[PDB]
Write an enzyme that holds these catalytic residues in place. Structure first.
Site, short mmCIF file in Angstrom:
data_model
loop_
_atom_site.label_atom_id
_atom_site.label_comp_id
_atom_site.label_asym_id
_atom_site.label_seq_id
_atom_site.Cartn_x
_atom_site.Cartn_y
_atom_site.Cartn_z
N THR A 1 39.57 45.48 39.73
CA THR A 1 38.50 45.05 38.82
C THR A 1 38.22 43.57 39.06
OG1 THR A 1 39.05 46.69 37.15
CG2 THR A 1 37.86 44.79 36.37
N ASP B 1 44.07 42.49 48.19
CA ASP B 1 44.54 43.41 47.18
C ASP B 1 45.28 44.51 47.94
OD1 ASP B 1 45.08 45.12 45.20
OD2 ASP B 1 42.99 45.65 44.76
N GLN C 1 52.03 50.26 45.59
CA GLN C 1 53.02 50.70 46.55
C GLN C 1 53.53 49.54 47.37
OE1 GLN C 1 52.90 51.59 50.29
NE2 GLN C 1 54.68 52.97 50.31
N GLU D 1 46.98 50.10 37.84
CA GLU D 1 46.12 50.01 36.67
C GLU D 1 46.20 48.76 35.86
OE1 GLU D 1 44.33 53.66 35.72
OE2 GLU D 1 46.31 54.45 35.18
N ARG E 1 37.44 53.82 37.68
CA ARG E 1 38.80 53.86 38.14
C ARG E 1 38.81 54.58 39.48
NH1 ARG E 1 43.23 51.82 39.70
NH2 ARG E 1 44.95 53.32 39.88
N1 LIG Z 1 39.00 47.47 28.74
C1 LIG Z 1 39.72 47.13 29.79
N2 LIG Z 1 39.71 47.91 30.92
C2 LIG Z 1 40.16 47.19 32.00
C3 LIG Z 1 40.59 45.88 32.03
N3 LIG Z 1 41.00 45.54 33.30
C4 LIG Z 1 40.76 46.60 33.96
N4 LIG Z 1 40.40 47.70 33.27
C5 LIG Z 1 40.42 49.10 33.65
O1 LIG Z 1 41.64 49.61 34.19
C6 LIG Z 1 41.52 50.81 34.99
C7 LIG Z 1 42.31 50.45 36.18
O2 LIG Z 1 42.13 49.09 36.60
P1 LIG Z 1 42.07 48.76 38.18
O3 LIG Z 1 41.39 47.47 38.21
O4 LIG Z 1 41.47 49.88 38.85
O5 LIG Z 1 43.61 48.55 38.51
P2 LIG Z 1 44.51 48.52 39.79
O6 LIG Z 1 45.19 49.84 39.83
O7 LIG Z 1 45.45 47.45 39.48
O8 LIG Z 1 43.55 48.19 40.85
C8 LIG Z 1 40.09 50.84 35.25
O9 LIG Z 1 39.42 51.84 34.47
C9 LIG Z 1 39.64 49.41 34.89
O10 LIG Z 1 38.27 49.31 34.64
C10 LIG Z 1 40.70 45.16 30.82
O11 LIG Z 1 41.10 44.01 30.61
N5 LIG Z 1 40.28 45.86 29.73
#
Ligand SMILES: Nc1nc2c(ncn2[C@@H]2O[C@H](COP(=O)(O)OP(=O)(O)O)[C@@H](O)[C@H]2O)c(=O)[nH]1
EC number: 3.6.5.-
Length: 317
Positions: free
Chosen positions: A17, A169, A173, A12, A147
């Site tokens: 993203t 990416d 894990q 997360e 998400r």
């Molecule tokens: N507002 C906000 N939401 C973000 C930002 N970066 C990512 N998200 C949110 O973080 C949640 C998880 O991010 P994700 O990109 O899926 O993370 P990963 O688990 O690292 O791939 C999602 O709902 C994204 O849209 C940010 O800078 N600000």
């Protein structure tokens, strides 16, 4: 020249993203029938969020504003505990709306750091009117806000300044498996994402384990790893937007009890950056290029990426 980029970081932090913003910025982008595919995720995303809040209330023993909501709460489970996939109706929309609008609900929502809630919860919940539409089609921002957890290794090819990039990416894990990561020994650059807003948060299944520290332990692993001696380490202290609104209400001392400066965006963020940079032993030989980002903001990611690509050109191609 081809450039390989490894996106690392805890769960997360913004990794998937960023991948999405690469497609939007450097490629085709999300079309009308492409976004239509995320419509279901938007629904599932919104339904789960309200359920988590409605459920934390119990756990925290917070009561509804109006007792009429109790009935709405029950109706939420009859509709959600019936459908098998993220859908949305005019009835589901009313129950949710009345719930979101509730006082006890907002109180529990203000205490979100005590449970697990999707960052994008408020965004969709506050735009429920728009997304509840019978023929709603997600916008690009709605897609970036979704998400979806990464099972496999995602890859993206894009060209930028006559340099061809291949973005990997691998998810949390694998970011963690110390042996496996060796297969990426020669990457040009690693982009490490860090969620700034996690500073006052724990891991669901590790209720007492602060996320900012877990991410610091991982930076330390990658950073001072023998296989990346010649890989540029770029740090995305991501979610600068959420950190801003948070810092002025939750003290950094919750994360770093030894912090002595003030709790303003400026001081706290600088403290976080120093904390991560200091984990770098090869401080002389090796350099960390840190950037503050809002991965959901295409313009920001674009400007930041322009910068990143200018550094890679300067020392890795
Ligand atoms: N507002 C906000 N939401 C973000 C930002 N970066 C990512 N998200 C949110 O973080 C949640 C998880 O991010 P994700 O990109 O899926 O993370 P990963 O688990 O690292 O791939 C999602 O709902 C994204 O849209 C940010 O800078 N600000």
């Amino acid at each position: 020249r081809e450039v390989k980029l490894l996106l690392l970081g805890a769960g997360e932090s913004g990794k998937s993203t960023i991948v999405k913003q690469m497609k939007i910025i450097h490629e085709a982008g999300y079309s009308e029938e492409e976004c239509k595919q995320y419509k279901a995720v938007v629904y599932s995303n919104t339904i789960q969020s309200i359920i988590a809040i409605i459920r934390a209330m119990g756990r925290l023993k917070i009561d509804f504003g109006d007792a009429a909501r109790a009935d709405d709460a029950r109706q939420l489970f009859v509709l959600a505990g019936a459908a098998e996939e993220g859908f949305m109706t005019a009835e589901l929309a009313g129950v949710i709306k009345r719930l979101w609008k509730d006082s006890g609900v907002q109180a529990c929502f203000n205490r979100s750091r005590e449970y697990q809630l999707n960052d994008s919860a408020a965004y969709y919940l506050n735009d429920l009117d728009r997304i509840a539409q019978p023929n709603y089609i997600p916008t690009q921002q709605d897609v970036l806000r979704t998400r979806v957890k990464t099972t496999g290794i995602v890859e993206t090819h894009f060209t930028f300044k006559d340099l061809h990039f291949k973005m990997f990416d691998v998810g949390a894990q694998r970011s963690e498996r110390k042996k496996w990561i060796h297969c990426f020994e020669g990457v040009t650059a690693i982009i490490f994402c860090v969620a700034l807003s996690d500073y006052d948060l724990v891991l669901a299944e590790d209720e007492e384990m602060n996320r900012m520290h877990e991410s610091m332990k991982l930076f330390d692993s990658i950073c001072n790893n023998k296989w990346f001696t010649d890989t540029s380490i770029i740090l995305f202290l991501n979610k600068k937007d959420l950190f801003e609104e948070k810092i002025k209400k939750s003290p950094l001392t919750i994360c770093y009890p030894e912090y002595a400066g003030s709790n303003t965006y400026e001081e706290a963020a600088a403290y976080i950056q120093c904390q991560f940079e200091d984990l770098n032993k090869r401080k002389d030989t090796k350099e960390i290029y840190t950037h503050f980002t809002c991965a959901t903001d295409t313009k920001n990611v674009q400007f930041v990426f322009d910068a990143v690509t200018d550094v890679i050109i300067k020392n890795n191609l």
